Amino acid sequence: ARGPRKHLKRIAAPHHWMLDKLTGHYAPRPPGPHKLRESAPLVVLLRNRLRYALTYREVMMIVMQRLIKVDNKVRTDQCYPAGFMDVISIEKTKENFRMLFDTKGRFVPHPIREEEASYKLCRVKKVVVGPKGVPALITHDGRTMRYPHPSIKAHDCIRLDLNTGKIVDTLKFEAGNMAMVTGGHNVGRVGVIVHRERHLGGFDIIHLRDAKNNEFATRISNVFVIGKGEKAWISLPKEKGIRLSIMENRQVLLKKQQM
Amino acid sequence: GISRDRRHKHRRTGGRMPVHQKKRKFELGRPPAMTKLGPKRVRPVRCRGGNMKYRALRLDTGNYSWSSQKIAKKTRLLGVVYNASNNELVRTNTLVKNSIVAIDATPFKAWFRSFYGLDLGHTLCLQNKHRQQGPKLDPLLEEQFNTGRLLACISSRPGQSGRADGYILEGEELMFYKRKMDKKK
Amino acid sequence: KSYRTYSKTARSPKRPFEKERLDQEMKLLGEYGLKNKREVWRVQYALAKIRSAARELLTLEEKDPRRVFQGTALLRRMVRLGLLGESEQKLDYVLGLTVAKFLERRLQTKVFKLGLAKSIHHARVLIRQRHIRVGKHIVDIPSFMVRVDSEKHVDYAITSPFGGGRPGRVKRRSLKGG
RNA sequence: AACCUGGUUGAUCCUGCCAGUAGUCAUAUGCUUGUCUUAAAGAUUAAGCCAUGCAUGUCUAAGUAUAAGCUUUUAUACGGCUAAACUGCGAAUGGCUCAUUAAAACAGUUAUAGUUUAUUUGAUGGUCUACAUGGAUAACCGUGGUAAUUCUAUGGCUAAUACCUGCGCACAGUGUUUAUUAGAUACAGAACCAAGGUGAUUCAUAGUAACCGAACGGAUCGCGCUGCGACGGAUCAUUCAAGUUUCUGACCUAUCAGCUUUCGACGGUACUGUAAUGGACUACCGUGGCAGUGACGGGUAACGGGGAAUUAGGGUUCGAUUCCGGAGAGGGAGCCUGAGAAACGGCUACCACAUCUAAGGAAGGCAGCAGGCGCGCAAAUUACCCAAUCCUGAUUCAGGGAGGUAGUGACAAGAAAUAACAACCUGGAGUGAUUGGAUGAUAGGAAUCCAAACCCCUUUCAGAGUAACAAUUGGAGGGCAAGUCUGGUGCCAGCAGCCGCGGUAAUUCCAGCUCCAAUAGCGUAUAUUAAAGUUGUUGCAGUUAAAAAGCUCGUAGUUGGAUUUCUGCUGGAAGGCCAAUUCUAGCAUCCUUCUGGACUUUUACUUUGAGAAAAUUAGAGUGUUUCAAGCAGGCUUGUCGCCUUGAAUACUCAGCAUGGAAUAAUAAGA
RNA sequence: CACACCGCCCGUCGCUCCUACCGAUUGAGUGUUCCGGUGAAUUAUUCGGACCGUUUUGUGGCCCGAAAUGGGAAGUUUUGUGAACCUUAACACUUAGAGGAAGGAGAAGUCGUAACAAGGUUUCCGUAGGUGAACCUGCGGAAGGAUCAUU
Secondary structure, eight states: OSSOOOEESSSSSSSSOOOOOOSSSEOOOOOOOOOOOTOOEEEHHHTSSSOOOSSSHHEEEEEEETTTEESSSSSOOTTTTOOOOOOEETTTTTTEEEEEEOOOSSSSEEEEEETTOOOEEEEEEEEEOOOOGGGEEEEEESOBBBBTTTOSSSOOOEOOOOOSEEEEEEEOOOOOOEEEEEEETTOOEEEEEEEEEEOOOOEEEEEEETTTSSSEETTTEEEEEESSSSSOSOOGGGGOOOOOHHHHHHHHHHHTTTO | OOOOOOSSOOTTTTTTOOOSSSSOTTSSEEOOOBBBBSOOOEEEOOOOOGGGGEEEEEOEEEEEEETTTTEEEEEEEEEEEOOOSSSHHHHHHOOOOOEEEEEEEHHHHHHHHHHSOOOOOOTHHHHHHHHHHHHOOOOOHHHHHHHOOOOEEEEEEHHHHHHOOEEEOHHHHHHHHHHHHTOOO | OOOOOOOSOOOSSSSOOOHHHHHHHHHHHHHTTTTSSHOOOOOHHHHHHHHHHHHHHHHHHHEEEHHHHHHHHHHHHHHTTTTSSSOOOEEEEEETTOOHHHHHSSSHHHHHTTTTTHHHHHHHHHHHTTOOEEEEEEOOOOOOOOOOTTTTOOOOOOTTTTTTTTTHHHHHHHHHHH
8 A cells, every 4th residue: 555565575476487485485576678577587587597696695796796788788776677588698708698488488598699689679569759740669678769660560579779779670560470479378489470350449369370280369469579471580499489288298308307 | 634535425326335444645635716806826736746736816817819810818807707607706706717707808909900900999011911811800799899898718727727818709609698698687 | 374385194084983994904004014093094095195086087088188198197106106017007997906005015015025124013113223225325214105116226224233334232232341 | 985873662664853973284171292394373352451672774986074083195175984964765665453344345357538656767858157156054163941852942153966046049949728720541533713540539749829937958976179877857658556447246134115315315517626537526407316136224253355174066164364455553533744645663633541740841652573461261582683585775885573593382284112033831823021132212422504502414422121211091881892890889979972870789880900992192162064865956845744825816036839941962171990070162043342351130058269466276297215395306527517407287257259050038020 | 551541641729940021110321323512633715924135225434224025933814624522312232120920940739630442521623702720612614533334
């Protein structure tokens, strides 16, 4: 009541962080570009994915060196919400991490090449006219690129340059274009787009087809266009967003563990 | 204070509504400034957000747009003439929205001489061009000008803005309110 | 307040006094050398988890994707645990299990089966007195239950007199005393 | 484990309850208690009352340093380092409790074109003495008052990112307030004259005519013609939110049937008010709104839900309590500051309690953490620390009874000691204190653990022979497993959940001996679940056992006859198995407007799909020594370690969407 | 009825105890909200202007005449929000009461004999009247009768 809540609790955290039940009563709380449940804070990358830090203390000792950057910019706050399709860049080690969705429905820092780690994609939420009658995009990231093409519509991605501010490569939202899912049940799945239903009132949905010919649906808010009909602007994680079945995921896992 | 909420007062069934909560600041109202004629005074009320909302208390003057001619002049007020809601507000001369008011009409008469040169009671070319471009003036507005007055509807909310603005009455609105002025007489 | 799950391993029967029941339980104490009737009811309860799992699965359909997944996981446990033999992998066979199958698999018997212990009672005392290496590390607890690849592996602990260490304490008292 | 035994009779078969039995990860209580792991704990009644101490503070190269402070380096504005104080930000989170509260709250599901939003992230912007504007305030110094406090006056200096002013092109910006034009879209054109964005708008935005000062357009700070970032503040998104808001949903009660209104009840017009929408409020005007499908009122030993207990299925009862909402800080009410409070570890007032007083006055709110009194059947230490987990701040550094660690602890859950083996009478493997030699309970080290102790796990010097290191708790007529034993008592004392024992031979009392059941536990009391097909939808009963209105009409309610493109052959894609089963195109006269959706009356129903927090629950994987658990691990003389490591998945009426030939409502009747 | 007609068993009356009921006292106390009355504090508003300073002249060669006009205290006007207390009434819940009159329990008393057999007047129903008590009688029913039955 009475104002914004400064604590978040463990358990009442998101499940896709995979913070454990014991070993803490509270969990780190991420406001930044991204939402609370559609992001992951910079602490649980460093300690609970990348395994650089042990403790919450040690993440302060890393981040206040000014070694961590995101989007070619130094972020000093340890609880910064670093979300979908943000680049992370550490100068020592000289390795870069683009955050994608894993096929199971988790965040994972996908390691990438140095030339690839310049650019990143931003799907545009809407397009809107600012003052002096100038046009302007706005993104899922909460950037606002201005003077686009007239070409560029809602619900489609743009390759940003990052080294400079400006856009470079557009993409369109149509049938036969590659598209990852960012939320809901089918998260972490990439497939070409077959068809979308309108439903003139609320909630457009899209059916789309995995590269092993599995068909599945999501709302348009969740869908995020990568690239053209086959091929893709970005590098993909392990499995490339197929999501193999429950008995298959059993068989591959226990076949691994026997060595 | 003044509670705007629906937790007091009845249900649609005619049943008392249970209330288990104390009054909330976001369910606020405030005492109404029945603003009037006089020399200007105005009070900045600090509202939710931090945002200021300026309460009128006495207003002499106002910006009033003539619609057809497409001009607006700053003008003094004389008196409140009619109100739709309450006859007590006309009795005290209380300015509110939708309230019909008297106006000097010497700003418009000076403009109408200067712009057109038909009048009421090198350029010349510019005046002629303006006349061709836009001056017949209704028969009732011709009679209305002779007194040195006009009639006009207050369009702004004085309590929120801290400002009397309006527009001049013309055509069907003007013919309408001339009935209900004359009917009480 | 603390986030720790917990459960009950056993539960008592509805009839306290039946001569049919009390005789057949007393045989299972006498064969396998058990402390009390809770140790039977533990295994009685532990079977009924596995049995009610198979009872749920077996009603459906052999081509149903729930049964083919959850059945094959359940059959892996019974092969691993050495409870059902590998020649029959049918889910139907799990139903034909008994308490004697579980109680032959625990470490009281598998010591005795090994034969080092000699007698059922002695085997329990050897387990609790810190002998008998199962695999790499020694095990203190009668109700262990062995996973069939591990069963060949049971041997006396490296430490201890049977094993080849200091001879406890009482042999030293005789040896140093003399 | 989808379970049943005793009791009505001289005996039988019934209906039928009473008693027995079992569970609770439900309280209380009795007797008993060796070990290690985990761990509920002043909820029930008194949301009754509180002594003492503690629980919210905070500083960077970067707002303000003349401490009459420190410190060795010695600086003509300012060497650094810093007490104190001003300014900034926080104190509205967290924690605790369950008294209120029954279409209220809450839950899932919409909407915000009906709005505010510190901060974060990204944008934007010359247009109005400019080598720099003004005068007061602490701390400090001097000095008092009062019995007394986080009471403070008079006098003298001095600061700003405090407070307040305030020129400016390279008439004239942006914002506010009103008026008002554009904001196009199913088709081509001809002749004559004077192009953002939604399903959808009055939206974005541009333009025109004026309005006001009450708001922005930097009089700020650090490292280094020139870079980097600290702070400030406006508009627009963004994010953390919050406020309203659509639909559907709840326990008992009819010995509650008619509620609501002139003083807002239901609606209309026009104000007002609000952050905005609204009878939210005010004027006039109409006479409505809800109810037998339960309105209105009453009861709750009622905060709601996620969930918990309960061994077929269907259910019944519980949910103060780990998470998410809600409400409250003795009772009510009012209000300041701020982005945000109707705040109580903020203030003002009354009422109810209560503290100090020198008797004039002053101060108080443990349903925060311990602790005490009192209520009770009923509940722990006035302990140590920010090391883990997170949060606040000017912030790598400071603070935190949030939180963690220990103590008390048979509320509870898990594992399992109290012996084992020999040789030396019953002989068809068990006994026999007859001797006999072969691991921790304990006590103290070592290292390990720990913020500092402590426990666990390792290894150590001692450490059992009636293994005196001695297992108890309830029973022995039936139900109910186990003595027609032996003394004492004599319808006495007492037992006895029910039936029944006791009147001088007691298979039940009070003892002894022996045996039975469970076992570090077991008995009792209350509530609750199964048994209960003794509340019956699945699933009872109503001739005589409990029970068919004396009999007809009858409105809702419930339930309603048959009947409307069925058959056949030829493909196609799949398909299990040594052609069946799915789905689908044609042809028997079968639409089209176009290049996937429009029409087929409308739903229910069923199918698949969307979206819906975790914890808990089921469940994949994994030797926490087993196990309850936990979410970890596993390989390996290799070192940018690898398994491009794992932590799957299901589950969550009403609402949104969709394929479909029956069934059932419903519509109709060119 | 089964201890078997020396059976079983009904009601008044008498004695002792326990539980509830009616009951004059215009009973009693606690709690709740209804109109009405008085009404603390306070938002807003009205005037008000302790003394703080901006210019303007006055005047002693930065003091004091004063006139304009920003800031703003105490006090004050009218509203609304409205605690608290009181009167009346109603509703809710505990609670006293002389006397009256139920039910069950004792464990055995007094008076009958009503029912169970044709229980010695068959039993029973509805209704009415009467009597120490069970009960009795009138009118119409029923077999649960003591008759499934005869021009």
